[PDB]
């Protein structure tokens, strides 16, 4: 039975996303403990994403050098040990935690780049598609589990440190199993010149660049929200006269909204392709516009009620995540197969570069700049963070415009791809 390897890799990916988003739930505790402003809070996630984006292509290339199971297990052990060590960092030191987050990002990039190739090599059928679908559905569930685990451990233990201590141990329990229940596959296949030629061909392409910018905007919005929303909700609750719950609620909402958004995007694409051939970018653009509207609406109605904020977060995150299952189909319809893989790598770089990497530190810097100009108070800091996160709907609308431009150039670039393939 080869399904044991798929199951253990799926559990490992769940734990990977849990470890990635554990810091999100206890960002407030970390800020209170270390006596730092929002700049460091954003910088943690920024460094994590930067290390992830730098290391992912390197590990992807290294996966064809030696056995992938060994390097995958080594990366899992490395990031687990780094997190466990970071759980015991002295208060007066802050750069050590940043370096630990960078090392964890390196390990997570290694795992995320290596494991899907192993899963794809294990199965060659519709079962491969089903297993990849499960492995990728593990993402929102993993993020929700990370949020709720951080909240629950912080509440029960009484100290946030154990939040970084519970996850690594399971990783070891995972890693050994991966060292045992993952079969070894005996598979194999001008590199710089090929990269240069593919980059030159792709730059001249039109819809590909706009789609990459749109997914970069999506990554920007998702990173900023997933990094700052629980803290913003806690500040809003502090503002209200009424006296961990927010993190659990946001984790459950994140999981449910990710699954629902993927489902509704797939359904809208299925039931809208009959109208016209440009359904794939149009659905994404409509979802982005709706998500931007609801992201503005939550900040409009955050001060009034928290139930409305939860509902608006639910709807906005669903609409925002609706594009994840359609971006790949947009990409594979324009780029020719020979240059597809490289294209993905470039996108997997660009979406991280202009998007997820800069978003948390930019939001923190804007919030700090606004807060410095005014006397420090819970109301004023809440307003400053709200104004900082008000930049998200602007980026979401820009991504919607980019999706509209992709729809405009869709048919022309498809025709160019067809005539190049047949040439």
């Amino acid at each position, epitope marked *: 039975g080869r399904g044991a390897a798929a199951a253990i890799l799926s559990l490992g990916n769940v734990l990977n996303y849990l470890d990635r988003y554990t810091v999100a739930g206890v960002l407030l505790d970390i800020q209170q403990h270390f006596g730092v402003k929002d700049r460091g809070a954003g910088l943690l996630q920024s460094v994590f994403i930067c290390s992830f984006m730098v290391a992912a292509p390197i590990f992807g290339y290294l996966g064809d050098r030696f056995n992938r199971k060994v390097i995958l297990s080594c990366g899992i052990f490395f990031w687990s040990a780094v997190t466990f060590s970071s759980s015991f960092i002295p208060q007066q030191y802050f750069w050590l935690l940043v370096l630990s987050r960078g090392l964890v990002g390196i390990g997570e990039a290694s795992y995320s780049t290596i494991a899907p190739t192993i899963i794809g090599d294990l199965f060659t059928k519709n079962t491969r598609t089903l297993m990849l679908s499960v492995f990728y559905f593990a993402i929102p569930l993993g993020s929700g589990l990370g949020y709720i685990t951080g909240s629950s451990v912080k509440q029960a233990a009484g100290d946030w440190h154990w939040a970084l201590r519970v996850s690594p141990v399971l990783g070891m329990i995972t890693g050994t199993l991966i060292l045992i229940l993952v079969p070894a596959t005996k598979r194999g296949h001008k590199a710089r010149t090929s990269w240069l030629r593919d980059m030159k061909a792709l730059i001249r392409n039109r819809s590909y660049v706009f789609s990459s910018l749109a997914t970069s905007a999506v990554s920007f919005a998702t990173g900023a929200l997933g990094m700052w929303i629980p803290l913003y909700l806690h500040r809003a609750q502090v503002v209200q006269k009424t006296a961990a719950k927010d993190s659990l609620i946001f984790g459950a909402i994140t999981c449910f909204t990710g699954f629902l958004g993927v489902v509704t995007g797939a359904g809208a694409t299925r039931w809208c*392709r*009959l109208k*016209t*051939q440009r359904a794939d970018p149009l659905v994404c653009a409509v979802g982005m516009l709706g998500s931007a509207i609801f992201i503005c609406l939550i900040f409009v109605a955050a001060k009034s009620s928290i139930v409305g904020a939860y509902i608006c977060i639910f709807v906005g995150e669903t609409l925002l995540f609706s594009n994840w299952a359609i971006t790949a189909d947009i990409l*594979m*319809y324009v780029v*020719i*197969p020979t240059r597809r893989a490289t294209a993905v790598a470039l996108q997997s770089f660009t979406s991280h570069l202009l998007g997820d990497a800069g978003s948390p530190y930019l939001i923190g810097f804007i919030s700090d700049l606004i807060r410095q100009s005014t006397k420090d108070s819970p109301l004023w800091e809440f307003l400053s963070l709200g104004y900082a996160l008000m930049l998200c709907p602007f980026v979401v609308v820009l991504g919607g415009m980019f999706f509209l431009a992709t729809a405009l150039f869709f*048919v022309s670039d*498809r*025709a*160019r*791809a*067809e*005539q190049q*393939v*047949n040439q």
Partner: nanobody
Amino acid sequence: QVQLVESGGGLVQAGGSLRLSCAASGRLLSWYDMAWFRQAPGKEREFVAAVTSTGAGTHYVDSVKGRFTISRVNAKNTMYLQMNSLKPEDTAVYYCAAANTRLTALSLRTTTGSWAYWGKGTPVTV
């Protein structure tokens, strides 16, 4: 679910010109790469020509280049084929086929089995 209907095929005098129209109404035609095949009386199905989704790619046979033209219109949801200077060996039944669009070499896809969708087929006699 796409239904293909052929029209304009029939017996014609040698050396003339003819137009064949393949119409689809089940779904949108912009999602399908189309092609024409012929069933010779003494042979099996044979590839004739093919048109990609946007019409930017065309492939023919060594005995077909410079004699046949094939194109499509998605606004009217119909593909057309023009045959000129017909040879006596062209008397056969022609089938219009459509397949899910793929960014593969159109010339390499001439296996008469990859096209999951077929039509009624019309006989043309020279």
